Amino acid sequence: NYNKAVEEEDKMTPEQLAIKNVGKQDPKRHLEEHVDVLMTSNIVQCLAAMLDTVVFK
């Protein structure tokens, strides 16, 4: 629910990348901090889904 509630303001950025021609000084980049959290957090969740099939046999 964190990873949706902040993803809508994550996607409020490509509208700001539509500057039709160019009207924005430098990238002002907010791509990150929601790659990595999703990445390692759901690595943890998939290896947790491993963990029952690990401990059981």
Partner: protein, 93 residues
């Protein structure tokens, strides 16, 4: 029996426990009062379900021949640990 079919029918109960169909329910509700076994006994099939129990006192032949569970556990969870790690081997990184 270590095996499954832990939704046991009442049949062995009413045969070898010298009890009747109307009294298997008391046989296990008095055991709920006892508190060593707390089965979720079926009553659409009348099956006496097995949950967790208080096992024994001593099975010295099975204290010796628990290897088929203990060493089973040891080498097989070890081997499958080696297999999970062996499929994710070269992301040692």
């Amino acid at each position: 029996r270590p095996a499954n079919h832990r939704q046991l029918t009442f049949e062995e109960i009413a045969k070898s426990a010298k009890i009747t169909v109307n009294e298997v329910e008391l046989l296990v509700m008095k055991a709920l009062s006892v508190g060593l076994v707390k089965g979720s006994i079926d009553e659409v099939d009348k099956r006496v379900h097995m949950t967790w129990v208080q096992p024994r006192v001593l099975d010295l032949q099975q204290i010796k021949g628990m290897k088929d569970r203990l060493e089973f556990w040891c080498t097989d969870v070890k081997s499958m640990e080696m297999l999970v790690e062996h499929q994710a081997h070269d992301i040692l990184t």
